[PDB]
Amino acid sequence: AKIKARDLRGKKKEELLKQLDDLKVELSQLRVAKVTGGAASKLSKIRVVRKSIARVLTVINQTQKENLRKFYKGKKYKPLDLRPKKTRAMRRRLNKHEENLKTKKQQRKERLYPLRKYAVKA
């Protein structure tokens, strides 16, 4: 009955939340058994259920985040965790369009006097 994210990524959020909260019920029971002595089998399934909980919460957060990205796709103002992250200085620097902007004088110079290609024979 071991759960995998490739099988988790097709469910709907009602059964995903159901799976999540039965896992949390089982983790609570396992900690009760841990205090009351229980058994080494239960103490070893503690880590299994915890990693399963981490798996389920990863899948839910990832689905919700990609739905948010799809909704904000093509919008003018996106939230601060949906705009890119790269580096503060790289965010401060110019974008390619206003980098490649040029003046009419300088592009007129470029049209009038292009740098030629040439060799000098000996």
Partner: protein, 120 residues
Amino acid sequence: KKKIRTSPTFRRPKTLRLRRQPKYPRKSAPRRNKLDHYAIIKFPLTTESAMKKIEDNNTLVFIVDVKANKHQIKQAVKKLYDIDVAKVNTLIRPDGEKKAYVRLAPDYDALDVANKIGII
């Protein structure tokens, strides 16, 4: 005439202050409530003083989160164990977790609640 300053003090005239209508939310989704009921209650306590409290004062005793207050502990117990709670006395232990004694309503019984939980 007919507008008259009846006071020697000029005060800053009150103006309009618009509410915010932002073009985009600063964060995407509301943050998940990471202090839910399963986070509130960690496990019961099963020491001899705990058993005395169970058989005498109709009260259970849990190790709970440090951030949880008596209202959250009472609501979490009443929800995930489906009982009624008379009161909640909490302390913080010298190890650093919150020990919460929860005394049940008199129509319920701590013995059979502990039997359903499994600490018995």
